[PDB]
Amino acid sequence: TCPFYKKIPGTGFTVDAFQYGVVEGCTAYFLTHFHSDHYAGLSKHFTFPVYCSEITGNLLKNKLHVQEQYIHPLPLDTECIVNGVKVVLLDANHCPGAVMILFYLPNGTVILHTGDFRADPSMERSLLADQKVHMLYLDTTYCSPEYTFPSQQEVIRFAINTAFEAVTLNPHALVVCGTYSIGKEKVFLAIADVLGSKVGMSQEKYKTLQCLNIPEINSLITTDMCSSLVHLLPMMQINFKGLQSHLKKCGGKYNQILAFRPTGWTHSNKFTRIADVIPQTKGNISIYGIPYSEHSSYLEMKRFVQWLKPQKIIPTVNVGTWKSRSTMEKYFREWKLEAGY
């Protein structure tokens, strides 16, 4: 049954709770972003209102075939009223169309649900600055001090230089980028831009990207694999067997694949730096795993929470074990101690 951490008290609202059936008491279902563990159970047969960003609305309509009459897109950074309750959507710095939700309760309580987010100093100058927040429903994916990773910009710089060098040395080398959901488009689009290419992909992935309000997107992407020296593939196909096969499909037009797997965290981040990474090479194919995160590092998360000063924190990730829960609660007490709220 629907967990408490997906319910907004003193409203008829749930958040990312589509896989429980009809939740008793729910008049409006919010969807923070289009990732499968969060929309799980939405379909063309869903008959209750869905509140979400314009981009997430494009994806529900065009990918899941949800009927238009149930989709309520809201603009960002705008005071909106939903079934009598003031709400605001804020950019979550996660994947395209991902939002955080501010709920202003009739009683005067203010609630922030982060969805999935990568906390950033810039959030300290949004509409969150303008009043007290009592409760925080927090993306705790990497809530442990060992999770350090570099800035997105650093990782993108590394990827652009590596690709450029390899292709300049061998103009018949192909770049491949793995994907499985929306998110991490900056990795492949930055690589393509530096190489003066469009990105080649399947028709299904092409449609997906057409939903994202990316400016000039038609000048950036393509289905024509032949006219394209950055390609996208399923992450499931980013391995030697899967790459070889794909190299065989290109019709003797490339003699070398440089591929990137954008992974969240791996235990090689507790030792090695970004400058000091290496690939896994079997022949003319080489696969790099790069630590491109769309969730908060430990330190990013800690700074955000210390700034916001919430009275209560409810974790939304890593909640299924007692050890995880207990460990998160300890970090939250230390943060409040070190800062004095």
Q: Which residues are at the interface with Ni ion (CB under 5 A)?
A: 35, 116
DSSP string over 252-277: S--SEEEEEEEES--GGGTT--STT-
* CB 98, min distance to Ni ion, A: 7
CA dist list (Å): 92 to 55, 122, 215: 13, 11, 19
**Residue whose CB is less far from Ni ion, 147 or 254:** 147
Q: Tell me which DSSP letter residue 48 carries.
A: S
Least distance between Ni ion and beta carbon 68 (Å): 25
In whole angstroms, what separates CA 121 from the centre of its chain?
A: 18
Q: What's at 30, amino acid-wise?
A: F
Give 40 or 80: the residue with its C-beta nearer to Ni ion.
40
Closest distance of CB 92 from Ni ion, Å: 9
**Residues in CB range of 278: below 8 A, 6 or more apart:** none
Residue 44 C-beta: closest distance to Ni ion, Å? 22
Which H helix or E strand runs over 103? strand 99-104
Q: Which is nearer to Ni ion, 141 or 197 (CB)?
A: 141
Q: In the complex, what is the shortest distance from the CB of residue 94 to Ni ion, in angstroms, rounded to a whole number? A: 6
- The distance of closest approach from Cβ of residue 267 to Ni ion in the complex, given in angstroms and rounded to an integer, is 22
Q: How far is the CB of 100 from Ni ion (least distance, A)?
A: 12
Please classify residue 204 by burial: count the beta carbons closer than 10 Å to its beta carbon, then call 0-12 exposed, 13-18 middle and 19+ buried: exposed
312-315 and 135-138: which strand pairing?
parallel
Placement of tokens 């429980």 in the chain: 20
Closest C-alpha to 167, from 41, 283, 258: 258
Token readout for 94 is: 């996660």
| DSSP per residue, 62-113 | HTS---GGGEEEE-TT--EEETTEEEEEEE-SSSTT-EEEEEE-TTS-EEEE
Q: Which is nearer to Ni ion, 116 or 185 (CB)?
A: 116
Handedness of CA 117, 120, 122, 126 (dihedral sign): positive
Q: What dihedral angle (degrees, nearest 10) is formed by the CA atoms of 215, 102, 85, 98?
A: 30
Compute the least distance from the CB of residue 56 to Ni ion, in Å.
12
Query: Under a CB-based contact definition with an 8 Å cutoff, are residues 187 and 177 in contact?
Result: yes
Q: Closest CB to Ni ion among 116 and 300? A: 116
Closer residue to Ni ion in complex, CB, 57/115: 115
Name the residue nearer to Ni ion (CB basis): 187 or 258: 187
Nearer to Ni ion, 3 or 9 (CB): 3
